[PDB]
Design an enzyme around this catalytic site. Structure first.
Site, PDB file in Angstrom:
ATOM      1  CE1 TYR A 148      34.321  47.558 -36.892  1.00 33.80           C
ATOM      2  CE2 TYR A 148      35.363  48.991 -35.261  1.00 33.80           C
ATOM      3  CZ  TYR A 148      35.412  48.306 -36.458  1.00 33.80           C
ATOM      4  OH  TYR A 148      36.545  48.384 -37.223  1.00 33.80           O
ATOM      5  CB  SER A 183      39.138  48.386 -34.956  1.00 34.34           C
ATOM      6  OG  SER A 183      38.847  49.758 -34.766  1.00 34.34           O
TER       7      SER A 183
END
Lengths: 244, 266
Positions: free
Chosen positions: A151, A138
């Site tokens: 995350y 990501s």
């Protein structure tokens, strides 16, 4: 048909980026092993794709990741491409109130799953002397402020593990790379999972045989070229501040 | 206190902004400072203010003038310990479609060529010493796009590359090369006049995630840190002073962290 008769294992394959990647790799001629915890959706996609099979796999459990790799080898005798993918976010909210349990559960999927995938896929591939290990990270793996705390830590860790693994495995003939989708645009059109699938297929293809340890960013330029912020400098009649 | 006692520093763009703050702080830290700028009245006034400082007229876009400023430091003090490539200068802005080559070249002459000339001639003095520190004031625009004009952004990226490249040559000679990257705002770039000082403070306040304005004295302190013996193994580094914007997002971009703690997924 850039992956003709290649064997690919795709985790989180039953939805989102994982399903788009399984579909595209199958369309590109690969034999695909679909790994996910969604058995009904996973089996349905395996029925849809030619020569694909489903293997129940919780990537937070090392034995299941190893078993998915082993099943790929049992079915086809080789593994050419491993895709460590998870449609998963985990812990959210303030770092002041994030429990250790939520932290560990998040890293178990987003980081341990990648470590287990690289470890066990590499075991299969170093015997071949070839192979491609790909992780769906990501843009939160390259900067802060774009996703939750756990995350963002996990995704940075995945980029670090990608680079570290590549430094061991490259002399063994195995490439390790990552794709960094945006958390989604300056280009005005929406990012689709199929585009991430296409980036993964590019990286798995022989065209990319010297792309290694790289993080292929697919985010319309947000992390390095914020288009909203630039307007105050660029969206103006050309001029000059200072002495010529 | 006195981290640069009897060291010799040459600071370009010294008559205002970051350059003036750096000249002041290095003098306060005990250094002999040569102030280089094209602003004679401001430059001479600052030299009179600082103990043991002198002014040397220098347009850094002209290699000969940069070389002459280094020679002036050597003539006056016999050595050069620290070089600061600094310019309070922006240049071309606006759409790339209509940016002239002349505006492009004028901008790069100050922001990039001037740094090359400064590294080249400071290093000539320093490799003879076996020691020295060459510092360039780049910008957050040298680290990513969207933070300054096109020529500015390209030049500042080039300054970081030249910083890294020069360090790889000069390190075994005992000479360090580093950069500092202040955050900026378009107000500081554009707004000039009699209220320009407060306009820039306001602009910097709203732009900082920390909510307080970046002041030139803080960049001076970053440069003094990099020149000090504490930093003797900091090399080729870009010390970013931007309240975290380049790596943690602009102010207000991550309000989602303040949501009630929860867990989403399996």
């Amino acid at each position: 048909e850039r992956l003709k008769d290649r064997v690919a294992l795709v985790t989180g394959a039953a939805s989102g980026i994982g399903a788009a990647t399984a579909r595209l790799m199958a369309q590109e001629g690969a034999f695909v092993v679909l790994a996910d915890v969604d058995e009904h959706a996973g089996q349905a996609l395996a029925r849809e794709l030619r020569d694909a099979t489903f293997a129940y796999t919780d990537v937070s459990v090392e034995a299941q990741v190893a078993a998915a790799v082993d099943e790929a080898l049992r079915l086809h005798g080789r593994l050419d491409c491993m895709v460590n993918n998870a449609g998963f976010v985990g812990a959210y909210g303030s770092i002041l109130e994030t429990s250790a349990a939520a932290w560990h559960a998040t890293l178990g999927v987003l980081l341990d799953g990648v470590f287990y995938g690289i470890k066990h896929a590499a075991r299969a591939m170093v015997k071949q002397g070839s192979g491609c290990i790909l992780s769906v990270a990501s843009t939160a793996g390259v900067m802060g402020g774009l996703g939750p705390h756990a995350y963002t830590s996990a995704k940075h860790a995945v980029i670090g593990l990608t680079r570290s693994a590549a430094s061991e495995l490259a002399p063994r003939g195995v490439r390790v790379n990552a794709v960094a989708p945006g958390t989604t645009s300056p280009l005005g059109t929406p990012l689709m999972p199929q585009e991430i699938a296409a980036a993964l297929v590019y990286l798995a293809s022989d065209d990319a045989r010297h792309v290694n340890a790289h993080t292929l960013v697919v985010d319309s330029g947000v992390t390095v070229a914020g288009a909203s912020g630039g307007a105050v400098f660029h969206n103006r009649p050309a001029g000059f501040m200072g002495r010529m």
